[PDB]
Write an enzyme that holds these catalytic residues in place. Sequence first.
Site, mmCIF file in Angstrom:
data_model
loop_
_atom_site.group_PDB
_atom_site.id
_atom_site.type_symbol
_atom_site.label_atom_id
_atom_site.label_comp_id
_atom_site.label_asym_id
_atom_site.label_seq_id
_atom_site.Cartn_x
_atom_site.Cartn_y
_atom_site.Cartn_z
ATOM 1 N N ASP D 51 0.803 -1.238 0.000
ATOM 2 C CA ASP D 51 0.000 0.000 0.000
ATOM 3 C C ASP D 51 0.834 1.285 0.000
ATOM 4 O O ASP D 51 0.429 2.299 -0.586
ATOM 5 C CB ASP D 51 -0.950 0.038 1.199
ATOM 6 C CG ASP D 51 -2.318 -0.495 0.872
ATOM 7 O OD1 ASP D 51 -2.852 -0.170 -0.212
ATOM 8 O OD2 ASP D 51 -2.864 -1.235 1.715
ATOM 9 N N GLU D 82 -4.872 4.483 -0.633
ATOM 10 C CA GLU D 82 -3.716 3.597 -0.452
ATOM 11 C C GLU D 82 -2.803 4.042 0.691
ATOM 12 O O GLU D 82 -2.535 3.266 1.611
ATOM 13 C CB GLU D 82 -2.892 3.451 -1.742
ATOM 14 C CG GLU D 82 -3.642 3.027 -3.011
ATOM 15 C CD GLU D 82 -4.343 1.665 -2.932
ATOM 16 O OE1 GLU D 82 -4.800 1.258 -1.854
ATOM 17 O OE2 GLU D 82 -4.486 1.013 -3.980
ATOM 18 N N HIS D 86 -5.298 3.227 3.941
ATOM 19 C CA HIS D 86 -4.947 1.812 4.078
ATOM 20 C C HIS D 86 -3.638 1.585 4.806
ATOM 21 O O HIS D 86 -3.615 0.874 5.815
ATOM 22 C CB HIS D 86 -4.886 1.107 2.726
ATOM 23 C CG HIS D 86 -6.188 1.087 1.992
ATOM 24 N ND1 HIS D 86 -6.304 0.611 0.702
ATOM 25 C CD2 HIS D 86 -7.422 1.514 2.351
ATOM 26 C CE1 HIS D 86 -7.557 0.731 0.307
ATOM 27 N NE2 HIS D 86 -8.256 1.276 1.287
ATOM 28 N N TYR D 90 -2.878 0.055 9.185
ATOM 29 C CA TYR D 90 -2.044 -1.025 9.715
ATOM 30 C C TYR D 90 -1.259 -0.576 10.925
ATOM 31 O O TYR D 90 -1.071 -1.361 11.844
ATOM 32 C CB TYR D 90 -1.089 -1.606 8.670
ATOM 33 C CG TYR D 90 -1.773 -2.124 7.427
ATOM 34 C CD1 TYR D 90 -2.693 -3.168 7.491
ATOM 35 C CD2 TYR D 90 -1.493 -1.562 6.181
ATOM 36 C CE1 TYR D 90 -3.332 -3.631 6.334
ATOM 37 C CE2 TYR D 90 -2.122 -2.012 5.032
ATOM 38 C CZ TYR D 90 -3.027 -3.054 5.111
ATOM 39 O OH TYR D 90 -3.642 -3.510 3.961
ATOM 40 N N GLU D 149 -3.368 -5.377 -6.730
ATOM 41 C CA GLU D 149 -4.685 -5.167 -6.109
ATOM 42 C C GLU D 149 -5.448 -6.475 -5.836
ATOM 43 O O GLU D 149 -6.059 -6.653 -4.768
ATOM 44 C CB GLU D 149 -5.577 -4.266 -6.995
ATOM 45 C CG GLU D 149 -5.086 -2.810 -7.153
ATOM 46 C CD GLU D 149 -5.381 -1.935 -5.929
ATOM 47 O OE1 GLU D 149 -5.963 -2.429 -4.921
ATOM 48 O OE2 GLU D 149 -5.065 -0.723 -5.975
ATOM 49 N N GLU D 183 -9.945 -2.498 -2.423
ATOM 50 C CA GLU D 183 -9.026 -3.068 -3.424
ATOM 51 C C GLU D 183 -9.777 -3.785 -4.531
ATOM 52 O O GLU D 183 -9.344 -3.745 -5.677
ATOM 53 C CB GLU D 183 -7.981 -4.013 -2.825
ATOM 54 C CG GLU D 183 -7.377 -3.617 -1.490
ATOM 55 C CD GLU D 183 -6.411 -2.417 -1.507
ATOM 56 O OE1 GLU D 183 -6.462 -1.528 -2.408
ATOM 57 O OE2 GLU D 183 -5.591 -2.360 -0.549
ATOM 58 N N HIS D 186 -10.809 -1.132 -6.894
ATOM 59 C CA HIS D 186 -9.571 -0.603 -7.512
ATOM 60 C C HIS D 186 -9.059 -1.530 -8.612
ATOM 61 O O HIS D 186 -8.653 -1.062 -9.669
ATOM 62 C CB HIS D 186 -8.440 -0.445 -6.494
ATOM 63 C CG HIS D 186 -8.685 0.583 -5.443
ATOM 64 N ND1 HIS D 186 -7.728 0.925 -4.513
ATOM 65 C CD2 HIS D 186 -9.767 1.350 -5.168
ATOM 66 C CE1 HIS D 186 -8.211 1.848 -3.704
ATOM 67 N NE2 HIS D 186 -9.448 2.119 -4.075
#
Lengths: 683, 683, 289, 289
Positions: D51, D82, D86, D90, D149, D183, D186
């Site tokens: 990402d 991204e 995303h 994390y 993706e 994703e 995407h």
Amino acid sequence: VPKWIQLNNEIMIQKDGKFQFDKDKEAVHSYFVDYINQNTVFFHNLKEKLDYLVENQYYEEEFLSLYSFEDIKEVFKTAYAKKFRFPSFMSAFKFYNDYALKTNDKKKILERYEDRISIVALFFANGDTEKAKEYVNLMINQEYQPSTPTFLNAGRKRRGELVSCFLLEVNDSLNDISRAIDISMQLSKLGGGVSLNLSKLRAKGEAIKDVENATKGVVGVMKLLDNAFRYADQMGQRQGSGAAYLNIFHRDINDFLDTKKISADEDVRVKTLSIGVVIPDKFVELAREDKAAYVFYPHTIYKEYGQHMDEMDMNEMYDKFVDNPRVKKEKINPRKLLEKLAMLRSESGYPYIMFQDNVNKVHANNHISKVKFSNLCSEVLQASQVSSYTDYDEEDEIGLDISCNLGSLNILNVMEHKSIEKTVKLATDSLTHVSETTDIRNAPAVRRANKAMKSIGLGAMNLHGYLAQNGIAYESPEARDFANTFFMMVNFYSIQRSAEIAKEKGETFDQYEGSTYATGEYFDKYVSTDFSPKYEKIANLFEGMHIPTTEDWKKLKAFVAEHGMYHSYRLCIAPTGSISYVQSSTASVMPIMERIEERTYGNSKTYYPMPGLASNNWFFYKEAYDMDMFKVVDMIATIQQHIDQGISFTLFLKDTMTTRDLNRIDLYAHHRGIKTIYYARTK
Amino acid sequence: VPKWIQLNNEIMIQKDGKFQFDKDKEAVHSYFVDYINQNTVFFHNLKEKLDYLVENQYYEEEFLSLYSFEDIKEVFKTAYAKKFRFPSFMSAFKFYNDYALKTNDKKKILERYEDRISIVALFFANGDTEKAKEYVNLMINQEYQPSTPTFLNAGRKRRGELVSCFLLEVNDSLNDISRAIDISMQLSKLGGGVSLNLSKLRAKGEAIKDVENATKGVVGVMKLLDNAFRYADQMGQRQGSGAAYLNIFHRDINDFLDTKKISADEDVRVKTLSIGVVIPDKFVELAREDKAAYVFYPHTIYKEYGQHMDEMDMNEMYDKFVDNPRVKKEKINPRKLLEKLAMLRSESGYPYIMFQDNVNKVHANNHISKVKFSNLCSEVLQASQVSSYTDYDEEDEIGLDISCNLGSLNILNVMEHKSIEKTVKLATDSLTHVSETTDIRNAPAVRRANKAMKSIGLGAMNLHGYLAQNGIAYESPEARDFANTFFMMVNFYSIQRSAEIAKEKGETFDQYEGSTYATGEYFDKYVSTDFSPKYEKIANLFEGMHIPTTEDWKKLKAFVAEHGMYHSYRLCIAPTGSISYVQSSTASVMPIMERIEERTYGNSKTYYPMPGLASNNWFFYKEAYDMDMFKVVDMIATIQQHIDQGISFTLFLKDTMTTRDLNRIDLYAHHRGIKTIYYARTK
Amino acid sequence: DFTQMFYNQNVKQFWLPEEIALNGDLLTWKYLGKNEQDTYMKVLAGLTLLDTEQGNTGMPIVAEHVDGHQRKAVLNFMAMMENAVHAKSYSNIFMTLAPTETINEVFEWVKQNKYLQKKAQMIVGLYKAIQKDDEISLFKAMVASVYLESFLFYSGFYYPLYFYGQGKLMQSGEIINLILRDEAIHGVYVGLLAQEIYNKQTEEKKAELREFAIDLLNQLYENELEYTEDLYDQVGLSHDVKKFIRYNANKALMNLGFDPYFEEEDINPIVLNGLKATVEPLKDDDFYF
Amino acid sequence: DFTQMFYNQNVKQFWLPEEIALNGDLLTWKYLGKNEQDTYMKVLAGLTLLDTEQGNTGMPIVAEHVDGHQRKAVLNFMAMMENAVHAKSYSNIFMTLAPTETINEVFEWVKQNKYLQKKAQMIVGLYKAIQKDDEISLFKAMVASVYLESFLFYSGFYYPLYFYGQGKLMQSGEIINLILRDEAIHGVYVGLLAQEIYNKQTEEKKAELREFAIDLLNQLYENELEYTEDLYDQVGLSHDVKKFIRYNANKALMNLGFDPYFEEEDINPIVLNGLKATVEPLKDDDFYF
Ligand SMILES: Nc1ncnc2c1ncn2[C@@H]1O[C@H](COP(=O)(O)OP(=O)(O)OP(=O)(O)O)[C@@H](O)[C@H]1O
Ligand SMILES: Nc1ncnc2c1ncn2[C@@H]1O[C@H](COP(=O)(O)OP(=O)(O)OP(=O)(O)O)[C@@H](O)[C@H]1O
Ligand SMILES: Cc1cn([C@H]2C[C@H](O)[C@@H](COP(=O)(O)OP(=O)(O)OP(=O)(O)O)O2)c(=O)[nH]c1=O
Ligand SMILES: [Mg+2]
Ligand SMILES: [Mg+2]
Ligand SMILES: [Mn+2]
Ligand SMILES: [Mn+2]
Ligand SMILES: [Mn+2]
Ligand SMILES: [Mn+2]
């Protein structure tokens, strides 16, 4: 979830495509079989109950000592002989959660409805057992309802004042501003809503002791008052409520209004201070002709003329102010100001609108003073004189600060008992007693005006309920005909009772001789126009009751001329927030907002249908938002023509209508003679 | 850029590696030959000037009417005979921007330095031409400097009040709180800084007539006072400055402190009200022993004992408070509270620290009352009695609210002229006159305390300037020896003048008979300990002046016993912020913050070197931040042993040091007898 | 020291065009004169055209050359706002107020306009001149970007704010205020990235970069004065607009850590209405001396 | 025919990790074996890397070369998701579950892991090989992006989904499902753009492009097998994950308009269970009734 709450929520569950309204009645039974009777303290006899309540500082000894115990027991027996039953769960819930006397630990119920009514009646009668029984029959028939302060606190030692509407005049000085802050704090401590007139205060950028650009304007005073009202919040029970009124020709009017904008900064916005704007006819004329208006600096006008800007008639003074070079003024667009008022009312419901000339063209006490501002609920409209609070060790010049006495007739219960006269006279007597027993030692002008003016406010409620249960639409001409007749009779009997009290006590209100009552002008429209119902249905509604004619009004005018009038003001229609629940009535003379209202108490949901709502009268219980606001204005003006003070008139708007529609409603209210506009509630 | 501005900026342009200090002098010449002389208003003679200033409402005619014009001319000629020259540009700039009288439009200069000094002297003398000349010689020599209110406003029609600081006691009642707000607004309108003791107010969660958890605590009153000081901001010229003082044993002490936290919410944060904390020796003892302390609810203590918590000695009543079940208290960690104080002072410089036991172990008027709080600058430490402001139409019990007049001795000029005695006596007479002509009509307790206590504050400035210009390090023991001797002389001659005034007027201050002055205890350390200089250099510095010995102090003690003292309080060392510029003196007895200070005025920048700064005394003008705060504490304690009131002691801290270092400095100050700590300014 | 804080402020300011209903503007639009409608259209097209350059080139090119994952993320977010939110918002305002043919003509006019083109191409020229691994050229582009975000937009923003402060075109004025609030934070953020580069330079190089910034500001400012007269003389506002340009030029300079260039001036009130020391515990024996 | 609906779908799917409170996973995390926690951290770290590069490089570079303001707005929005949404999510998960040292160690582990470096080298190499106005280099990068993706993320997604499906780590799992939902759209969108370019080619050129796509897929696949074994052998799941990545490889091919390449297999059913008011002016007729 308790059983009564389930029975109440079963209303919305539709059986055969109809709401189970009758289930609400069952809920009440449950609410009394499961909760109220279990948590109600019972005594072996009424003597033990009264001794326990007096000894434990629940009641006052003075009002109970005026009667023998036999008379008190007879009054309680008269209250309990009605076998009154709350028709809806919310009525009993509101009474036993808001008004019923509870122990210091707030877990047991010491007062039933009959007990509270008997205590209030004994307090009202002031030693007359027959008068106490009359009051008990009045309140247990639910024909008359004392206001929340009076109903809750009458006869209780741990209590606030019985008056909760206070109007203060603030003079243009630091001493007067500090005294106004102090008095506002003291009256909020007593539990009253305080309204302050800020029009006499000089605008921002004015001179203090001949130093320029020194005054902070009325916005700094509003910040001080907002802090004072936040601090004084009924010992941390309710949020401190205050109102500030400014004339629309005051220069601070924009900044005033800017205190209610969402975009306003923290040093500009006041959160616990309601605002109202006083709009003279001159402003409406300027906006109508699109001529640019002028907002004036009050201190320059005071220096030039020796009188405050709000103390003189702007209709005849505006041109002289504009043409006077020594009067400082700022150019504004009155139509832009009206649009700003409409936008602010759409956003937050503020400001309250006072049409000064609409109030003062029918004001009976213009000789004492013109009505310059209203109360926190925008229905008290009385003459007020500003006080000159000087420095320490110097005698103050105490003026008149308005504090009227609230109480509401239940139109449905009053008219079904065919007792307009008796209910109005007994309510007037009770209001007179409460006004006479009010003694505020920290508000000198409030106390002086209470002693002198003896002003009371007798309101009405359940107008829409009565009309809907009688198959009459609130917007129909028949509804306005009924309101005209009913409130003309209310005014007639209120004036008759005031004159009778003046004759009995031998005294009128201060400066009565200059009033239109003394000169007979007040009765002009009553001695020439017949207010009997023009529709057969309304006449049949009034069957069994004598409707005062023009000859009766002439006799009343002669009686007032011979004997005077005890009360400077008698009638004002308050919103009647929570007492309408206990009385199972619609709030004030306003149309209902919802047919069935959903409320959340604790973590539980509850459902209150409007009183008497059923399938047959579902259509007649039209919601206020669905109604045409022009016809609501027409009804409120019809009522207002018989009310000496104002009516708490809330506008009910849809989200679709724009600020042009709000301004049109305001201008039609001004055209129709509406004195005050309370709120703009958007659905 | 102006020519004088360029000449003043030429100081920092080094020539041969040295600052061009002499350029500063050139700047003043420019500032006078290009701005002051052109902007001054000249008259044909003094008669036309005085007439123009009198009829145009610049001067009060009453004080000038006590002298024939010949006497006023002689006084002005005496002022101008000295040919006083400002040695630095900033001195003249500060005088002619902050203190010289200008026209209504502020386009021209009406008052020179000699004119202002002559007017102040004529006001001081009250009709005595010789006394007026003595005051003129005292001020033109710059031996004595009246405070900014007195110097700026003496003899002016548009003047405010001559008193700089006011201290109010707030009783635990809504009436008293509202009166305190009113008096604070009135005194801020008069221009004075107002300090309020909030220790008597009951804490948050206390009962207002049997309904519990009702009070907002001292934080609500703090918000009210903050808004009051914001509103009353000297007509928008100087921001309204207020101080709130709370005892460290008050339950709200944390919330109090939380008003100054930078992360505080808007409903708690207070930004225009300085905060001070009064710490008894009991709190320091508990923190030292690491024993968990208890903060107390004032209302419970008042109910149990009949007296306020701050009205009695905590060192003897703390255990009784803790062991009393009827007293409500909360557990706190005194060391954590000390660390919170240090962190708050590091972040914002607040709170002020008042060591109550250090103040009251040498307080001469403990019989009247113990000192429970200080002023906005934390140097006024006087007895105060709380007032009982009752309801309207009820008589108020007026107490004593502290108020003293400030005046500073210029140590360098006083010792250069070898006139400690004459300067001290004349300054005492001037402060007595300022107290006598002060009459505040909106603060009753302040007026009564001014009339009864007759308290004055005689400060000192240019201690560090004198020490550095004489080659004495401020932290050296020789400097402390000089301070000891000089301030013992100041105390001796102030007591002598007070006793002489009492003898000549036949009256002492109220309740003097119970004071330590009457009993002779105050003179104990003065009749047993010799305060003559212990170093030969200091003794040479004091040559030509009779240093009082134990025999002179015994004679003064006998004189006081025979005649009494006119002033309850005589000496208080104020910060002397901006008037120190005009006198070319370092601020107060504090060490200099910087050798050359860069200040931005308008769009220009100016550099003010410390008075007398040069190459030979560059390192004697050590910056305060570079100094050991323990030795500064030693100096302040040495001065404080001869000052009856407090000293505005600002702590000068480096960014590297931690809150533990600040706590150590505070505890050393408490150990050394420091009464109050003003500010924690971090470099 | 600052990227996570700006991340937070950026994402919490997220908004979409659909949130503001535009149709109610037609109730005040119909009451404006031809010159007012003409100026508004031209200003709007000016803002639209400049903002497109910022979305397609300005923000993405800076995101490409700046090192740091968190900075690239913030810059990506800002580029997204230009292309996905601002551009759609300007289009929505246009489609509400003018018919398709009128929109096409206004854009044809503004596309050929000398003063709009001069500034648009000056800014784009500096973005095109950025060289890989050359922080000087990156700084120059950042200066250009800050000048666009914090200065060049404001001759345009003036008019919608002027109406917004009078109660006219309130829906589109609300949209413009949200856009402007985004550009303000964009300008401050890119300004901090430019100061980071500036602070890594020698004293001679710094003086040279200051001269660059002031010279660029002067060129843009002189063209703004001409742009302003060209649009605002017909509605009598140019004097007040010029004060607003200088005030915003000073903000742009302050974003780049530079001193204000212009003297302080008051702004039109209608437009205004539209607009720890180280804690160390006490160790005992600190109470004894 | 599709960009507008993708624009609307992307913007309506907008989210931030802070919307999901993560402290609820604290106990189910504490209860996992050391092997399970290790694999989980590493899996999410591998996702973070992908990402990071998709946001910093892949999406912005494709946006630069694709024509049309609306297509660019969609691609810019996807780029922001991204790296601003995303990749950051994390870290929210890591900061909740793991101590700083374990977080530091896993980011050091991504730098030195040969399979993760190889896959980044290959994908980013293709992004950086795009030549202006050269549609073939652009197609190759779009194939790489679809593979990132719709294929490469899935060796990572398996494990959060595997736990979610057992009622474990459900707050972290909610974040992952939102990422996966993004994703998926995407991959479809970029797939449609790739097909546009492919459809312009001669049959001979198309045959070469299919060869490129299949060769690239196989090369990435072989590397992903080794990566999968390296991560999952310690938790006993490598064979199961391999079936999952083959399943998703077929979806990637389909997004590119190609036939499935791997035979269908039964996926772990646990993982399948893991899946102001309007203002009008006052007229003169409103003052009369
Ligand atoms: N709707 C109601 N409103 C008020 N009180 C009620 C209501 N329902 C029940 N109660 C209370 O509960 C008691 C029990 O009433 P119930 O309906 O059981 O029969 P009842 O014949 O009225 O009883 P009782 O012998 O108490 O008079 C009533 O006397 C009254 O005190
Ligand atoms: N530093 C200063 N402080 C105060 N006043 C000053 C100062 N410098 C100049 N002046 C004023 O400006 C005038 C300018 O005169 P200056 O000091 O240059 O000397 P002069 O003309 O020889 O006369 P004299 O010094 O005797 O006043 C002074 O007379 C005085 O009134
Ligand atoms: C009225 C009021 C008082 N207080 C606090 C502040 C005062 O210091 C304190 C005392 O108020 P009082 O004015 O003394 O109230 P009281 O005399 O009626 O009650 P009591 O007999 O117990 O003295 O109560 C509030 O915090 N909020 C309020 O609204
Ligand atoms: Mg006055
Ligand atoms: Mg009290
Ligand atoms: Mn933009
Ligand atoms: Mn931008
Ligand atoms: Mn992603
Ligand atoms: Mn993606």
